[PDB]
Homo-oligomer: A and B are copies of this chain.
Amino acid sequence: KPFPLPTGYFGIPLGLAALSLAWFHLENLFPAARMVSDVLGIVASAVWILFILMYAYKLRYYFEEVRAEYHSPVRFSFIALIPITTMLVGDILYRWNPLIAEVLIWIGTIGQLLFSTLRVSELWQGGVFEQKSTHPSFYLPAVAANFTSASSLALLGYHDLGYLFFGAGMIAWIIFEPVLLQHLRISSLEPQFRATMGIVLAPAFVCVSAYLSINHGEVDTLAKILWGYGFLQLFFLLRLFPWIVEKGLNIGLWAFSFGLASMANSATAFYHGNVLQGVSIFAFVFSNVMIGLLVLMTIYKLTK
């Protein structure tokens, strides 16, 4: 029996793809990592293909559900997961076929830029977006899609292009988070949306990963500044975790994967640069354990 695939589900391959790329950067330090990087990679791409097929199905037979998602001042943001993961799969495929990889990366970059130009600017005409629309998911089209373009174009050798996209993501981040934290302080989020709190972890770590990708792994003052703020939000989120899962654990916690994987990626670069190697090992293992718990609970839900 057919069914419209919920767009949020792209968060699953996203996380897994990100984790692949983290292990991929351990290769020259520990060659066995390459094996791990391949397995995650293949799995992430399999799911991605399947999900793309399902979403194409949803575009033909449930198109009005997609349109309603697209016009919502909140739900549209999850549409951005599609180009994002498309770019990440591109990065994975680069290790085997740089030509398919570049095609995918350009599809994802052009698509996310076009999505945000169409929709996020249109938010500025007012009267649709409301105060209660201020959701962490807004980071996906505004910030994460940009950081992913930046690292992917860097992967292809377009470093200055990557810098333009990186600046767009970083300043969009700093421009949106103030009002998001203020809204969280005043109204916060209903249990149905609380799992979305995990995206709050993402901006600093995704930022630093894209920055280190474009600047050839140079762990400078900026990268440490970013890492400090990221660990601050990590601690806040750890303290908040009981409240976030107050109504029970659920697949929505895949929202943390993006931050967790990015932490692991950044950890790798901090480890090559010989900066805070102990914190790096801790971060790398902790994000891997957390994404492993997520995969275990997702298999338990699927097989039951």
A interface with B by C-beta (< 8 Å): 73, 113, 116-118, 120-127, 129-131, 133-134, 146, 160-161, 163-168, 170-172, 174-179, 181-182, 184-189, 197, 204, 215, 221, 224-229, 231-232, 235-240, 243, 275-276, 279
Q: How far is the CB of A204 from chain B (nearest CB, A)?
A: 8
**Copies of this subunit:** 3
Q: How far is the CB of A205 from chain B (nearest CB, A)?
A: 12
A117 / chain B contacts, CB cutoff of 8 Å: 235-236, 238-239
A130 / chain B contacts, CB cutoff of 8 Å: 186
A125 / chain B contacts, CB cutoff of 8 Å: 188, 240, 243
The one of B113, B123, B163, B174 in contact with A175, judged by C-beta atoms closer than 8 angstroms, is: B174
A243 / chain B contacts, CB cutoff of 8 Å: 125
| Contact in complex: B188, A126 (CB < 8 Å) | yes
A133 / chain B contacts, CB cutoff of 8 Å: 185
19 contacts between A and B (CB under 8 A): A73-B185, A122-B239, A123-B185, A124-B185, A124-B236, A124-B240, A127-B188, A129-B185, A129-B186, A167-B229, A171-B228, A172-B232, A174-B175, A174-B178, A175-B177, A176-B178, A177-B178, A178-B178, A178-B179
For A177, give the chain B residue with the smallest CB separation.
B175
A236 / chain B contacts, CB cutoff of 8 Å: 117, 120-121, 124
| Contact in complex: B126, A170 (CB < 8 Å) | no
A124 / chain B contacts, CB cutoff of 8 Å: 181, 184-185, 188, 197, 236, 240
| Contact in complex: B227, A167 (CB < 8 Å) | yes
**Within the assembled complex, what's the spacing in Å between the Cα atoms of A122 and B164?**
36
A186 / chain B contacts, CB cutoff of 8 Å: 126, 129-131
**Within the assembled complex, what's the spacing in Å between the Cα atoms of A122 and B237?**
9
A235 / chain B contacts, CB cutoff of 8 Å: 113, 117, 121
A178 / chain B contacts, CB cutoff of 8 Å: 174-179
Q: How far is the CB of A165 from chain B (nearest CB, A)?
A: 6
Known: A130-B186, A186-B130, A275-B160. A167 touches B226 (CB 8 A): yes
Known: A124-B184, A126-B186. A221 touches B215 (CB 8 A): yes
